[PDB]
Every structure is written in structure tokens, then in C-alpha cells.
């Protein structure tokens, strides 16, 4: 799978066609990285685009469902196999940071 690369801050890239495209194992990385970031009832063309944030960060007691939905999004991605993810800090102020690790379809060629 190809996909246009995004630069550091994550804006789009035009020019260098066929070269601003991520090849693989990093295309999966980019595609998971910003599949997580796709609020659900945003896109009128995909209203279940990805997990529903306005209804999960705005309600108490969803950490388990945040994690289950992140695993859902990641696993249902073209190119990933497994996941290994949990929470690493405990809302250091009130923001919790979770650690997400997944095995792409690559690095399994032995």
C-alpha cells in the first residue's frame, strides 16, 4: 500500500509525485497513526470513520473502552497483525498517555 507522506507537523505533501508516497511498514505506521486520530461522526462520507472521541473523552469511565476501541482501529488496519498496548502514565495532570505497540505484517520474514 502506498500513501502520501506527511511531514513532521503532519500537513500534506504535494510535488515529488511517486516519491512523496510512503512505501510500506511505514505506510502502515502513518495509516495507524492517523486512523487513531479520526473522530467518528466527523466525516459525512464515513460517519463511523473511526472511534468516537467526542463521546469517549467527554464521559467518565471510558478508559477500558478507549483501549478496546484503539485496539479495534489498529487491528482492523491493512497491514498490522497484533497489538501490545496499555497505559503508561496515570493522567500526569489529567491527560493519560497510553503506549501502543503493534507488529506490522513485515518483520515476520525470518
Amino acid at each position: 500500500m502506498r500513501v502520501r507522506t506527511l511531514d513532521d507537523n503532519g500537513d500534506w505533501t504535494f510535488g515529488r509525485g511517486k516519491a512523496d508516497y510512503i512505501t510500506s511498514k511505514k505506510a502502515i505506521a502513518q495509516t495507524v497513526s492517523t486512523r487513531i486520530k479520526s473522530w467518528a461522526n466527523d466525516n459525512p462520507l464515513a460517519m463511523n470513520a473511526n472511534i468516537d472521541w467526542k463521546d469517549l473523552l467527554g464521559r467518565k469511565g471510558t478508559e477500558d473502552t478507549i483501549l478496546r476501541e484503539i485496539e479495534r482501529v489498529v487491528v482492523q488496519t491493512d497491514g498490522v497483525i497484533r497489538v501490545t498496548e496499555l497505559e503508561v502514565i496515570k493522567t500526569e495532570k489529567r491527560v493519560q498517555s497510553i503506549l501502543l505497540s503493534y507488529d506490522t505484517i513485515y518483520d515476520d520474514s525470518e
Binding site: W53, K54, L57, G58, R59, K60, G61
Partner: peptide
Amino acid sequence: QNTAITMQLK
């Protein structure tokens, strides 16, 4: 139960 709500994104 758990009717205590936060504020953000409401």
C-alpha cells in the same frame, strides 16, 4: 450511578 460528569467536550 456515575452521573458525575466532567466538563470537556460538551
